[PDB]
């Protein structure tokens, strides 16, 4: 119903409510304070952060998990620019995030004198949608279109610039009912049958999972197709969480990082490769496509063809629908060829070798393997796990097959540090009854640790682990390998236990290997935020780096 | 199509174009892009030199519009590219698939003290990229066609650095393939089937995509089964006409007395097909008190006045075909609906009776009637922008051409002639007729040389008023005085003959029809200048929104 | 100039233009920008309707180039603006001050489903802004002129939303004022005075700014006092000529045998005045083993091959005047220097002797000699881009015109005619001569109507080869075959007459001179078509870098 | 003197030394680590920060006080985007700051697939000068021009994007002598 709104801010908040938004992350400022004020009169919870970048990170987690866009709210100028890295990361990983940023008044003389920054131009390179509202009456539609652009197709981030006068002034208009997802049909039946027939013909078929395959709305369909077909599966990191070793016996590991993955050998062996929700950007096709197999592309969008990615059959449409139909045209489960069976057998052996459940590993500082094992003991199907960027990331990725977590946020193409804690707080807000474990190094921790105050204020049940080496190890090992000397990668030590407790959170510092498990256990059992510092000995990283592509 | 070692990037480009089915390229050579022109010499692809780059984009658009596959423009760096901009923005607005390949300085000189063409084309294209990685040459070009041809078709630009097209490269040609998209979900279709059965005043609003040849059969099948009233935007102007559907309600978006608008305002159910708000402001017809259904190849580009209740995204032809099978009875018009269609019938009779117009200069109606006589079902009619455009639109219901190119959101002048040459090349055995004002004519008349050189069977008509009338009448209405809309006279007969084309200048009313027939009878290019008396324009303008 | 309450923003704009001294505006009206055209009706400012927007920018550039004050183009939204782009990029490259005012949709529709013209003009302009604050209307316009006219002159674009120019506004007209910048520091000047006294092979390299009329007297005073050799880029082509300075060494940047390059390579001291690397690649002449001195209105735009040792920034005329007073003796040329100038003298004698060329089609040299005869010291000569351009440049030393417009970094075709019409309007009592090829001609020939309508005393010459020769010879050299550079013939005589202009077509060698004289004698527009035999081009191209 | 440099990074550092730079603030990453490495062989002190934004802030202070541009050094992607607010603030207050940011290799296929962010476009709205080196031989001039644009006229911030292959690969060229301020 077209109503008369005293403020555009009230219409904005009503639209957000129509979108199903449960909370908003951000920092208020003069230009955007009317939206924060209007938020007081709604069901939406205002979550003040300590740095805008983290508002975007928290929003992305909400988006990845619920599939519905997380929302960040910031003021003009630095308020907006402090979000950029956050928006780039969300867009990069395909997480739906909608950011509402304040701006000077439309007629502001500083506008023409360029006293104010062209935020739309700045955000354009790192978003799917970036626009400024210049017409008060287009307020509801623009916000609504920001959500659609962010959640539909290949998810991403959307930025909306709100001139101060527009949100403060009165407007005429009605709330646009969130239609959500359009009713898109599965691929054509003829197309599907053609693929079912290829499947019934293939001796060495395999599924390669990409971003869209890990989306929640495709979870049931994917499960059903794998159970019916029993065809091997490998996943890019943007789908790292869609399937794991413990839920599918024919899982071949994630591809894109290590040079000895069963997934890579099976793809090379395949006579039929079926990609689901995959995009060449998730993993260089040159690395796996040998052109010897028939290539099927299934996604909500046609393929971005290229030298090593020219599908023979393209099934564009509702992924869930297409997968369900395909599953109904599969007569029996695949009988692995002896070659494929050997490859899976080899992955089994390599996992046996990587395992160290029986090793003492009591050195101090701790061996990455000991920490990884300790982490595996506290993360279970009821726990979410967020991973930052650094050398510890490579170690965890190597053992993803051993983490039985409810879900894991690790994918990070931009390799942005500081994402773990904010990701965990966001993941916690989605399911406050569950526990969340975040892990980072000292580098990334200090970039977003200001949010520890946000965590205590919310009594967020998050346990953050810090691998302590007193430097930027991931960069140090790359310099050492190329130049055999270090530069700008070493810094001083800190008392992280005292650091954490200064926020009011529970802090711990592991002083010996023997103390690791007991400490993590005591930290996990704490009702509220907890931080555990773990001194690490990265001396063996080369042994691990030698397994990289 | 295996991976090969190409002597020049230019050779791979040409091969990729052949793979896309390109039959000709429009453009003007330059130092930076010359190797591609040279490479085309060993191709079956025909090189067609134009006289002004803008026209290469116009001709390409017509090719893309008719064939469904991108027309191709090839230009050089700097001014070669900047001259394409308007033609590209026009293609993008009308949804005509066009791929423009533009030359550029060597990659190493880009930063040296080199226009940032990509930044200049982004605002007016769906896809704008510069090849900075030689090994992705075929990739970028191939994806340029995908971007231009798929979803809502549009224009695509690809900047080719000189060193990249001149130097050796490795790569393979990528095969061309509209992916397999299926009809909208059967459940959704059933849902819409229900709404229809429950509607007493249903109506179809056709958009651009509804006019695509891939949906022609399904559309007809849907309309013939339900006999539900239909109205169209100008981008979907040719989807349906008065002759093949008695319940056609006209084109909406220009006149304030259309049966289509009256039916939309009366509707309790509006089903839009291949429609986008940009085609006709929803605020103009959507009262908001009618169930809105959206059917298209893409989700709805929602607006404050366009928030569908049911969105069906997928293959249009498939969707409509299923919908047709879910309709059991032909609609029984309501009293109000019936009245509205009856009015349009009486309205047409009136517009027709409006009768011995032998004045000179010629009365617009006289020119329209004569135009309709020479334009037959085998002829393509292209229409430029100006006052004559309104007169022609007013009578589209009586024009029976193979096809009409008139939709022009940007209102760009000079489109007619190049569109016609482009359209003629797609079907060189047919005749094409383009019409414009004297202002639009001089903006692209240099292509008459191209037409003569090609022996294009195009007849160009010029409504001569010696000014920019469409602007003048607006100035008159608002200011009661004119400024910058009047210019001198010309002898278009000699003008056209100078090109080696047949020229004619109507010097009296009775000479009109005979002149057109003689010009139409010419096997090759011909131009007819027609002096027009725009005195009655104010009476037509009153029928406008 | 007090603060006032204007009925329409358009009225304030017109007042601001008058304040800038604008005498005329070039352009084409449209709905969005019509109120400004209407407002100009009550102004002393003359409205000059063109036939294609690109030409409004070209004509404006000529106006700005000659008067030192920005020429003005006024166009409407969308295609009106996109059609200006190439003309704007051309102005910006040659340093011609131009201000373009473009219409735009109402501010509220900008985001609605409106080209982002500012983003499209930024790459090719010094200043590009959109007025989003009605109270800053005069501000933005005024600052547009400052940006265009000051420092290194260039083009400026200002987008005017329709509601802003149509709605009432408050504000005052801002008075126009080149600020008071003083000569370079007296210490710096003395430093350079020393270097000169110590140099045995000094030479001046003149750039764009050195050709500005404000520096003409000082320059002459400096050269006459030191008699130090001089060479110029094409942007500074008219600063000095062979007649007024016996130690002139020619124009550098095109031919590989210039005395200027030989002197630069020999120099132990090079003093650049109003020069910028973009005018002539420093890598081409700077060996790096000579003291480099930079004098200009702006700091040096340093490059790997242009890192001055002494940078003098400030008022050029003042700086040069002081430098002249710090020179005590006229330079005594060195043996090598003397030889080099002697060679150019013998070189010119040779280029001259090269003699009964009565072939038909006409030999380029025959056409050049004839052109030099009709071009006198009171005539302005505008030159388009093409092969004829090279021939003319080769003999610039024997052309004695009031002024020559030839510099064209973008190498944009079609500039000649509009430049001439623009130049003629600045001094309507003088004659203007423009020359182009058949390709360049058809890109802007629509302005012949504008010329006839204005009674412009312009003579346009066309070198007719029936193709794009400049491109063809490059294709020949590299591929030994042609592609896309050949088109059909035309009857330019009838073509020109159709506009109401006097047309001539040279049908034999002996007819050339008589034809030009008759065309020159016409008081109004005239066009002469001249068939040319480009067979010897390969022999001229060999003299190119 | 035109020399043969094993790495563009070495020429960059030599140019910085010619500019009088005493220290550099930043955080290293794969794309830009060769410049940090080359900094070890110079008189310039490497100052590692904990967040890039602060590298820009520290640089601005150096610039405001000495009048000569402060220098920040960051890696590609988030390394660059984390600087934006810092660059906007320096440019806003008229503080001379020169930021050198890494980038994927020029021919990186991710370039066209837009996998990497157009940093030049992002920094343009908040800087006086923003440019990417696409020609190894224009390395010294571009850095030199960044300082000139930052320190001269109304001071501000300048951004230079350095593709990984350009700083890692060999180059030919000489250090452009810092002329500093023209004699106006
Ligand atoms: C410095 C750094 C990383 C952090 C490494 O340190 P810790 O977080 O302490 O991990 P560890 O490797 O020492 O355990 S990742 C890393 C990455 C290697 O490129 N991600 C970055 N993110 C931002 C926002 N700026 C710069 C970089 C460059 N790289
Ligand atoms: C001047 C003009 C048109 C032309 C009118 O003249 P004729 O073509 O002679 O038609 P008529 O109306 O006189 O019959 S349309 C029109 C349009 C009204 O906006 N399209 C334009 N296209 C370009 C490329 N630049 C400016 C305009 C503004 N408008
Ligand atoms: C085609 C062409 C020129 C014209 C040559 O022909 P004529 O003007 O007939 O001269 P002539 O050489 O045949 O005598 S210049 C030239 C130039 C060599 O780059 N300038 C152009 N200007 C535009 C607006 N588009 C493309 C080019 C590429 N080049
Ligand atoms: Mg660390
Ligand atoms: Mg007209
Ligand atoms: Mg020619």
């Amino acid at each position: 119903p077209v109503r008369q709104w005293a403020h555009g801010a009230d219409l904005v908040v009503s639209q957000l409510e129509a979108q199903g938004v449960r909370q908003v992350f951000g920092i208020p400022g003069a230009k955007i304070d009317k939206v924060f004020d209007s938020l007081l009169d709604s069901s939406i919870r205002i979550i003040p952060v300590r740095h805008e970048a983290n508002a975007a990170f928290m929003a992305a987690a909400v988006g990845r998990i619920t599939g519905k866009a997380g929302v960040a709210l910031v003021t003009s100028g630095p308020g907006c620019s402090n979000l950029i890295t956050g928006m780039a990361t969300a867009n990069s990983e395909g997480d739906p995030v909608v950011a509402l940023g304040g701006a000077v008044k439309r007629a502001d003389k500083a506008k023409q004198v360029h006293q104010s920054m062209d935020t739309v131009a700045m955000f354009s390179p790192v978003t799917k949608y970036a626009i400024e509202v210049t017409a008060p009456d287009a307020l509801a539609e623009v916000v609504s279109n920001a959500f659609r652009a962010a959640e539909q197709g290949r998810p991403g981030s959307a930025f909306v610039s709100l001139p101060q006068d527009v949100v403060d002034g009165p407007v005429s208009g009605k709330v646009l009912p969130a239609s959500g997802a359009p009713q898109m049909g599965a691929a054509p039946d003829d197309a599907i049958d053609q693929v079912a027939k290829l499947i019934a013909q293939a001796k060495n078929p395999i599924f390669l999972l990409g971003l869209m395959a890990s989306q929640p709305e495709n979870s049931k369909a994917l499960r059903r197709l794998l159970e019916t077909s029993h065809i091997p599966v490998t996943s890019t990191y943007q789908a790292a969480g869609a399937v794991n070793q413990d839920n599918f016996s024919r899982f071949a590991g994630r591809v894109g990082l290590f040079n000895n993955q069963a997934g890579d050998r099976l793809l090379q062996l395949a006579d039929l490769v079926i990609c689901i929700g995959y995009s060449p950007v998730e993993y260089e096709p040159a690395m796996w496509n040998s052109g010897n197999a028939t290539l099927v592309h299934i996604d909500v969008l046609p393929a971005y063809e290229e030298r090593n990615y020219t599908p023979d059959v393209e099934l564009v449409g509702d992924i869930a629908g297409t997968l369900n139909k395909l599953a109904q045209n599969i007569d029996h489960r695949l009988v692995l060829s002896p070659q494929a069976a050997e490859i899976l057998r080899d992955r089994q052996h390599q996992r046996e070798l990587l395992d160290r459940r029986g090793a003492q590993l009591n050195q101090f500082a701790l061996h990455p393997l000991r920490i990884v094992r300790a982490m595996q003991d506290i993360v279970n199907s009821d726990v979410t796990l967020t991973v930052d960027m650094g050398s510890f990331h490579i170690w965890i990725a190597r053992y993803l097959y051993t983490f039985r977590a409810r879900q894991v946020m690790i994918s990070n193409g931009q390799q942005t540090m500081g994402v773990a804690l904010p990701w965990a707080i966001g993941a916690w807000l989605v399911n406050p009854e569950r526990k969340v474990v975040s892990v980072s190094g000292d580098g990334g921790f200090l970039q977003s640790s200001m949010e520890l105050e946000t965590a205590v204020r919310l009594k967020a049940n998050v346990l953050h682990l810090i691998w302590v080496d007193n430097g930027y190890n991931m960069v140090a090992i790359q310099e050492e390998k190329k130049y055999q000397r270090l530069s700008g990668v070493e810094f001083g030590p800190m008392d992280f236990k005292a650091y954490a407790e200064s926020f009011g959170a529970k802090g711990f510092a592991v002083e010996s290997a023997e103390a690791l498990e007991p400490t993590l256990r005591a930290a996990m059992d704490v009702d509220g935020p907890a931080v555990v510092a773990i001194p690490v000995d990265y001396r063996d990283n080369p042994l691990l780096m030698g397994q990289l592509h």
Side-chain angles (χ1 to χ4, degrees), chain A residues 1-108 110-178 180-202 204-219 221-549:
Chain A
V2 172
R3 302 171 40 178
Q4 296 307 306
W5 307 81
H7 310 287
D10 300 322
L11 173 52
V12 171
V13 174
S14 293
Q15 190 59 57
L16 294 179
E17 295 188 300
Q19 291 295 165
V21 174
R22 303 193 64 221
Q23 70 279 308
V24 174
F25 312 91
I27 295 176
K31 271 60 183 186
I32 194 70
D33 60 22
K34 188 66 205 79
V35 178
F36 281 82
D37 180 76
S38 296
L39 280 171
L40 293 170
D41 310 322
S42 72
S43 53
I44 300 173
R45 188 180 183 181
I46 298 173
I47 309 302
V49 297
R50 298 309 291 269
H51 191 291
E52 292 84 350
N54 302 314
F57 290 144
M58 284 162 88
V62 174
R64 182 178 305 185
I65 301 174
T66 75
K68 305 245 294 183
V71 183
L73 184 60
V74 301
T75 199
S76 64
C80 292
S81 53
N82 272 15
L83 277 185
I84 301 190
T85 292
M87 297 301 275
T89 301
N91 200 56
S92 192
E93 296 312 305
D95 293 320
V97 175
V98 171
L100 304 174
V104 299
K105 296 183 177 295
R106 295 175 294 170
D108 179 56
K111 274 280 298 180
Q112 296 173 177
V113 307
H114 296 295
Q115 173 59 56
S116 58
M117 51 184 97
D118 185 354
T119 51
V120 171
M122 299 173 76
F123 280 85
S124 286
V126 302
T127 54
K128 291 182 61 176
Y129 179 86
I131 188 181
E132 186 167 72
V133 184
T134 51
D137 51 299
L139 202 55
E141 59 178 57
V142 171
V143 176
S144 179
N145 290 319
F147 278 78
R148 284 169 69 73
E151 309 172 333
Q152 294 171 47
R154 183 148 295 244
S157 52
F159 173 72
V160 180
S161 177
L162 305 171
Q164 179 179 42
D165 60 314
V166 178
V167 300
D168 286 27
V171 298
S172 175
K174 59 189 174 185
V175 181
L176 301 195
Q183 297 193 68
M184 194 177 291
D189 309 303
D190 283 302
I192 304 187
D193 296 315
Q194 170 179 50
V195 176
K197 293 178 177 179
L198 290 171
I199 290 181
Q201 182 211 78
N204 287 99
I206 183 171
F207 290 119
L208 170 57
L209 309 183
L211 175 68
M212 299 315 293
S214 70
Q215 297 307 317
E217 65 269 29
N218 301 309
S219 181
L222 179 64
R223 187 178 187 68
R224 171 184 159 65
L225 176 63
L226 294 172
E227 176 175 59
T228 298
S229 72
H230 261 51
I231 290 172
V233 175
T234 195
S235 316
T236 61
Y237 285 88
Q238 288 191 59
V243 173
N244 203 13
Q245 187 65 55
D246 43 297
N247 55 222
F248 194 61
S249 71
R250 300 182 179 185
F251 178 65
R254 276 132 293 240
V255 290
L257 188 59
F258 305 100
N259 59 49
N260 52 191
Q261 294 294 70
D264 283 301
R265 300 213 286 155
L266 289 175
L267 280 169
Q268 282 158 37
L269 170 70
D271 56 328
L272 172 63
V273 178
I274 301 180
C275 301
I276 305 178
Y278 173 74
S279 172
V281 305
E282 299 181 55
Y283 182 39
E284 169 60 63
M287 296 298 285
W288 61 274
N289 201 342
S290 59
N292 293 300
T294 301
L295 179 68
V296 182
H297 176 73
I298 298 175
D299 187 34
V300 304
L301 302 168
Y304 292 68
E305 307 192 309
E306 64 170 66
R307 179 187 308 189
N308 302 302
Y309 199 65
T310 55
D312 298 301
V313 181
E314 281 183 49
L315 308 182
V316 180
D318 183 289
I319 295 180
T322 296
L323 296 198
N324 282 311
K325 291 187 179 297
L326 189 55
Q328 301 185 308
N329 279 288
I330 291 185
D331 292 299
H332 52 55
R333 292 173 164 167
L334 169 72
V335 172
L336 290 177
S337 70
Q339 297 59 49
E342 185 67 57
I343 288 172
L344 292 185
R345 222 137 46 198
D346 295 305
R347 174 175 166 74
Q348 178 174 55
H349 178 60
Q350 79 183 303
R351 288 183 282 124
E352 240 125 52
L353 292 173
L354 291 166
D355 193 285
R356 294 294 193 303
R357 67 188 66 194
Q360 191 63 55
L361 297 167
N362 66 308
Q363 73 190 70
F364 189 78
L366 293 69
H367 193 291
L369 237 52
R370 179 54 179 276
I371 301 173
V372 168
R373 187 222 279 158
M375 280 174 62
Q376 285 165 22
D377 297 329
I378 62 177
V379 184
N380 50 59
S381 58
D382 288 305
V383 177
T384 297
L385 175 66
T386 67
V387 185
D388 213 296
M389 186 50 74
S391 294
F392 58 84
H393 179 112
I394 307 306
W395 282 95
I396 290 180
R398 174 69 284 182
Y399 292 79
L400 273 184
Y401 71 91
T402 52
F403 285 91
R404 292 87 187 184
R406 179 159 166 272
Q407 64 185 312
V408 172
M409 296 186 74
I410 181 174
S411 196
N412 198 340
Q414 297 292 296
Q415 286 181 49
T416 308
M417 65 188 267
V419 297
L421 182 55
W423 271 350
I425 294 179
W428 179 76
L429 288 173
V430 173
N431 292 81
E433 68 295 317
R434 294 189 170 300
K435 191 78 171 191
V436 177
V437 169
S438 54
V439 64
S440 75
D442 26 30
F445 173 74
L446 227 57
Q447 295 216 328
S448 58
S449 60
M450 65 282 283
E451 296 312 329
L452 265 183
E453 188 280 308
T454 292
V456 172
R457 201 192 323 132
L458 299 169
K459 305 189 195 307
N461 200 33
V462 175
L463 164 56
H464 189 83
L465 304 185
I466 306 174
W467 285 45
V468 187
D469 75 314
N470 299 315
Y472 297 131
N473 187 259
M474 181 167 261
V475 185
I477 55 181
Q478 304 194 67
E479 301 185 328
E480 186 181 66
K481 193 204 71 178
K482 298 187 283 187
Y483 321 122
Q484 296 170 65
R485 61 181 183 172
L486 309 181
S487 52
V489 293
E490 294 166 288
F491 45 69
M494 289 182 60
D495 187 345
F496 288 112
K497 175 188 174 77
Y499 182 88
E501 305 196 309
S502 80
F503 287 82
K506 290 294 185 176
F508 302 79
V510 182
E511 295 177 58
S512 70
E514 294 65 43
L516 185 53
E517 295 65 38
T519 302
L520 295 188
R521 192 60 265 170
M524 268 299 264
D525 294 336
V526 170
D527 192 13
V531 181
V532 179
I534 311 167
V536 60
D537 181 355
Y538 278 146
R539 283 183 304 180
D540 289 333
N541 283 351
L543 296 183
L544 174 59
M545 302 308 120
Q547 295 180 57
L548 298 170
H549 266 154

